[PDB]
Design a binder for this molecule. Structure first.
Ligand SMILES: Cn1cnc(COC(=O)N[C@H]2CCc3c(C(=O)Nc4ccc(F)c(Cl)c4)ccc(F)c32)n1
Ligand SMILES: Cn1cnc(COC(=O)N[C@H]2CCc3c(C(=O)Nc4ccc(F)c(Cl)c4)ccc(F)c32)n1
Ligand SMILES: Cn1cnc(COC(=O)N[C@H]2CCc3c(C(=O)Nc4ccc(F)c(Cl)c4)ccc(F)c32)n1
Lengths: 143, 137
């Protein structure tokens, strides 16, 4: 009966990240490509660097495990579309969680946590303003 | 792809933990229970506390997502649960044990114990002392 919030220690919460709609978040493919492109040397490094790095390290690997289970279904699980349904669960339902988690951490390193959090409410408020009055410019993430 | 080692930032490797045999590690139920008993308050806290705390936090939750998925397949299809607890179980048993033990007794102590144990257990019956080396504060 323990309840740990992956975001608590970084000044956010699961409720908060779910304020951004599903379709705001980049893909997992695109997210890992970006972590590598901007951070491989630090993630692969033997320094802590930041708490963010530590967490990101763990989430890439954890997504890894979920993906190596997804490959293992089929190549070991005999039945046909009862195999596809599992790999479909993995890539859409859990994938959303990790899309949230990875975004949060790459975006925090790239842009700074306090800037990430402000952009988060600002986009959530903005996107929910209906088209009728919602400005052309969604707010921006920068630095 | 990049090759990240979850142990590297704490001065060990996946290789080095595999030195300890499968049956050295407690069960996951037993590991999570100890995490809670010894650390619930720090793990649920809003401070980082330490890199070990940060990583362990993520591992518990990760194991949780795998259980979540495992409970899901049983009720949404008709096992896959064989693989989750046999193959993947061990990896999290290693990772959970490593971080809990590092916080409990100290990284450098854990690493000394880990080599001394792997050597000791490999010394065959005929000559292995009956008393294994000890892990303690
Ligand atoms: C050039 N510049 C300087 N500052 C800015 C930022 O501007 C915006 O994007 N404004 C947005 C804010 C939300 C909103 C609403 C609104 O009422 N939104 C809303 C949506 C959902 C809610 F739940 C609530 Cl309470 C309010 C109506 C009109 C708006 F223009 C805006 N640009
Ligand atoms: C002064 N100024 C004017 N424009 C700018 C820069 O504007 C951009 O084009 N910013 C982009 C960068 C990505 C991003 C995201 C985002 O979510 N990015 C993201 C973060 C982490 C990731 F891993 C990935 Cl794959 C994407 C959300 C909103 C954005 F506006 C922007 N400065
Ligand atoms: C001379 N002396 C001084 N103290 C003592 C008595 O100490 C013990 O009985 N040590 C035990 C403590 C647990 C443990 C483990 C272990 O790794 N346990 C473990 C670690 C982390 C966990 F999360 C869990 Cl559930 C179990 C491995 C070897 C051990 F010897 C001991 N004699």
């Amino acid at each position: 009966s323990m309840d740990i919030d992956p975001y608590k220690e970084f000044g956010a919460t699961v409720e908060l990240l779910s304020f951004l709609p599903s379709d705001f978040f980049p893909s997992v493919r695109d997210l890992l490509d970006t972590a590598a492109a901007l951070y491989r040397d630090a993630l692969e490094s033997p320094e802590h660097c930041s708490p963010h790095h530590t967490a990101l390290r763990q989430a890439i690997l954890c997504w890894g495990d979920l993906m190596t289970l997804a490959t293992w279904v089929g190549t070991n699980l005999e039945d046909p579309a009862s195999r596809d349904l599992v790999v479909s669960y993995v890539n859409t339902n859990v994938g959303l969680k990790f899309r949230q988690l990875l975004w949060f951490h790459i975006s925090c390193l790239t842009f700074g946590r306090e800037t990430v959090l402000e952009y988060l409410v600002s986009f959530g408020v903005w996107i929910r303003t209906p088209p009728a009055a919602r400005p052309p410019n969604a707010p921006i993430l920068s630095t």
